[PDB]
């Protein structure tokens, strides 16, 4: 939920920062300079991805042979569909009763 | 998502049950008013 989305956003931001640092290093070392030293840090950012790789290497890996999270748990979804259907049926019955009452006048 | 939809269906069931209770009071009232007269 929260932690999974946070780690995903963190990995996405890490990839974006790595791409930006690579582009900046290319633009700096292409033409003209001490700032090019920070370009080396871009390579360090690449190592961060490797750490993420390590983070993916020594990750959960529950089975690594099948798919986890058994069951879509959509029984609740089906129950909600039935509830909405009952609500619609009640609305239809109420509309019929209202038409009958209006005809009574 | 499970907890969210469980709360949603609980609210829906509560609303439907309140509707049934109000309609029950209404049907009792109207049936008593109707059966008191025979055309």
């Amino acid at each position: 939920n929260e932690r999974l989305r946070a780690l995903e956003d963190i990995e996405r931001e890490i990839g974006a920062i790595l791409q930006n640092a690579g582009t900046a290093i290319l633009e700096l070392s292409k033409e003209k300079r001490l700032l090019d030293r920070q370009a080396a840090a871009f390579t360090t950012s690449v190592q961060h991805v490797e750490a993420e790789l390590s983070a993916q290497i020594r990750y959960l890996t529950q089975v690594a042979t099948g798919q986890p999270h058994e069951g879509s748990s959509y029984s609740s979804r089906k129950d909600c569909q039935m509830a909405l259907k009952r609500v619609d049926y009640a609305r239809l019955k109420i509309s019929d009763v209202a038409r009958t009452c209006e005809q009574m006048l | 998502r499970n907890q969210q939809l469980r709360a949603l269906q609980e609210e829906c069931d509560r609303k439907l049950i309140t509707l049934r209770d109000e309609v029950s009071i209404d049907l009792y009232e109207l049936e008593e008013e109707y059966y008191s007269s025979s055309s």
Binding site: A90, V97, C101 | E11
Partner: peptide, 30 residues
């Protein structure tokens, strides 16, 4: 008197049904 009572009961039931229609639309709005 019977007709008046029937009309009053019908009006009350119609008001209740309209209120329930409104709250049902509100609940379905989510």
């Amino acid at each position: 008197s019977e007709l008046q009572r029937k009309d009053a009961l019908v009006q009350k039931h119609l008001t209740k049904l309209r209120h329930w229609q409104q709250v049902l639309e509100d609940i379905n709005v989510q």
